[PDB]
UniProtKB/Swiss-Prot annotation, chain B:
Changing D8N: In strain: Delta/B.1.617.2, Mu/B.1.621. Subunit of the fusion protein that is processed upon entry into the host cell. Mediates fusion of the virion and cellular membranes by functioning as a class I viral fusion protein. Contains a viral fusion peptide that is unmasked after S2 cleavage. This cleavage can occur at the cell membrane by host TMPRSS2 or during endocytosis by host CSTL. In either case, this triggers an extensive and irreversible conformational change that leads to fusion of the viral envelope with the cellular cytoplasmic membrane, releasing viral genomic RNA into the host cell cytoplasm. The gene is S. Residues 7-49 form a coiled coil. Changing N27K: In strain: Omicron/BA.1, Omicron/BA.2, Omicron/BA.2.12.1, Omicron/BA.2.75, Omicron/BA.4, Omicron/BA.5, Omicron/BQ.1.1, Omicron/XBB.1.5, Omicron/EG.5.1. Changing S40A: In strain: Alpha/B.1.1.7. This is Spike protein S2'. Changing Q12H: In strain: Omicron/BA.1, Omicron/BA.2, Omicron/BA.2.12.1, Omicron/BA.2.75, Omicron/BA.4, Omicron/BA.5, Omicron/BQ.1.1, Omicron/XBB.1.5, Omicron/EG.5.1.
Amino acid sequence: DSFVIRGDEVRQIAPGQTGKIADYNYKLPDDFTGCVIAWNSNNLDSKVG
Amino acid sequence: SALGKLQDVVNQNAQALNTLVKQLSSNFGAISSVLNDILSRLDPPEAEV
Protein backbone atom coordinates (compact mmCIF):
# COMPACT_ATOMS: atom_id res chain seq x y z
CA ASP A 1 0.00 0.00 0.00
CA SER A 2 1.04 3.60 -0.62
CA PHE A 3 -0.35 6.79 0.92
CA VAL A 4 0.83 10.12 2.33
CA ILE A 5 -0.08 11.19 5.87
CA ARG A 6 1.25 13.78 8.32
CA GLY A 7 3.90 13.25 10.97
CA ASP A 8 1.58 13.02 13.98
CA GLU A 9 -0.49 10.30 12.25
CA VAL A 10 2.34 7.87 11.47
CA ARG A 11 1.95 6.23 14.89
CA GLN A 12 -1.73 5.53 14.14
CA ILE A 13 -0.77 3.17 11.27
CA ALA A 14 -0.25 0.11 13.48
CA PRO A 15 -2.24 -2.94 14.67
CA GLY A 16 -4.39 -1.83 17.59
CA GLN A 17 -3.97 1.93 17.21
CA THR A 18 -7.14 4.00 16.84
CA GLY A 19 -7.98 7.59 16.00
CA LYS A 20 -9.05 9.55 12.91
CA ILE A 21 -6.67 8.42 10.15
CA ALA A 22 -6.74 4.81 11.40
CA ASP A 23 -10.54 4.42 11.69
CA TYR A 24 -12.04 6.33 8.72
CA ASN A 25 -9.29 6.16 6.05
CA TYR A 26 -7.04 3.12 6.50
CA LYS A 27 -7.49 0.41 9.14
CA LEU A 28 -5.00 -2.38 9.92
CA PRO A 29 -6.10 -5.70 11.43
CA ASP A 30 -5.03 -6.82 14.89
CA ASP A 31 -3.22 -9.85 13.39
CA PHE A 32 -1.35 -7.81 10.76
CA THR A 33 1.85 -9.70 9.92
CA GLY A 34 3.91 -7.14 8.03
CA CYS A 35 6.30 -4.22 8.23
CA VAL A 36 5.32 -0.54 8.18
CA ILE A 37 7.73 1.64 6.19
CA ALA A 38 7.53 5.44 6.42
CA TRP A 39 9.88 8.36 5.86
CA ASN A 40 9.79 12.14 5.72
CA SER A 41 9.07 13.63 2.29
CA ASN A 42 9.02 17.39 2.91
CA ASN A 43 10.95 18.07 -0.30
CA LEU A 44 8.58 17.31 -3.22
CA ASP A 45 5.07 16.89 -1.71
CA SER A 46 4.86 20.41 -0.23
CA LYS A 47 4.75 23.42 -2.56
CA VAL A 48 4.86 27.11 -1.70
CA GLY A 49 1.47 28.32 -0.49
CA SER B 1 -24.11 -36.36 65.75
CA ALA B 2 -25.36 -39.51 63.98
CA LEU B 3 -25.81 -38.30 60.37
CA GLY B 4 -22.33 -36.82 60.27
CA LYS B 5 -20.64 -38.15 57.14
CA LEU B 6 -23.59 -37.47 54.82
CA GLN B 7 -23.99 -33.95 56.22
CA ASP B 8 -20.25 -33.35 55.78
CA VAL B 9 -20.38 -34.52 52.15
CA VAL B 10 -23.39 -32.30 51.43
CA ASN B 11 -21.69 -29.31 53.07
CA GLN B 12 -18.49 -29.93 51.10
CA ASN B 13 -20.42 -30.06 47.82
CA ALA B 14 -22.32 -26.89 48.74
CA GLN B 15 -19.10 -25.07 49.66
CA ALA B 16 -17.45 -26.19 46.42
CA LEU B 17 -20.40 -24.91 44.38
CA ASN B 18 -20.49 -21.62 46.29
CA THR B 19 -16.75 -21.13 45.78
CA LEU B 20 -17.04 -21.91 42.06
CA VAL B 21 -19.81 -19.31 41.84
CA LYS B 22 -17.94 -16.67 43.86
CA GLN B 23 -14.77 -17.10 41.78
CA LEU B 24 -16.57 -15.06 39.08
CA SER B 25 -16.38 -11.94 41.29
CA SER B 26 -12.58 -11.66 41.35
CA ASN B 27 -10.29 -9.44 39.28
CA PHE B 28 -7.37 -11.92 39.03
CA GLY B 29 -5.20 -8.86 38.36
CA ALA B 30 -7.56 -7.17 35.89
CA ILE B 31 -9.47 -3.93 36.47
CA SER B 32 -12.82 -5.62 37.20
CA SER B 33 -14.76 -8.87 36.83
CA VAL B 34 -17.48 -7.58 34.46
CA LEU B 35 -16.76 -8.37 30.82
CA ASN B 36 -19.35 -5.87 29.58
CA ASP B 37 -17.95 -3.07 31.75
CA ILE B 38 -14.39 -3.89 30.64
CA LEU B 39 -15.37 -3.85 26.96
CA SER B 40 -17.30 -0.60 27.40
CA ARG B 41 -14.50 1.17 29.30
CA LEU B 42 -11.56 -0.02 27.16
CA ASP B 43 -11.04 -0.45 23.44
CA PRO B 44 -10.73 -4.08 22.25
CA PRO B 45 -6.93 -3.89 21.73
CA GLU B 46 -6.40 -3.01 25.41
CA ALA B 47 -9.30 -5.06 26.80
CA GLU B 48 -8.03 -8.25 25.13
CA VAL B 49 -5.33 -8.55 27.81
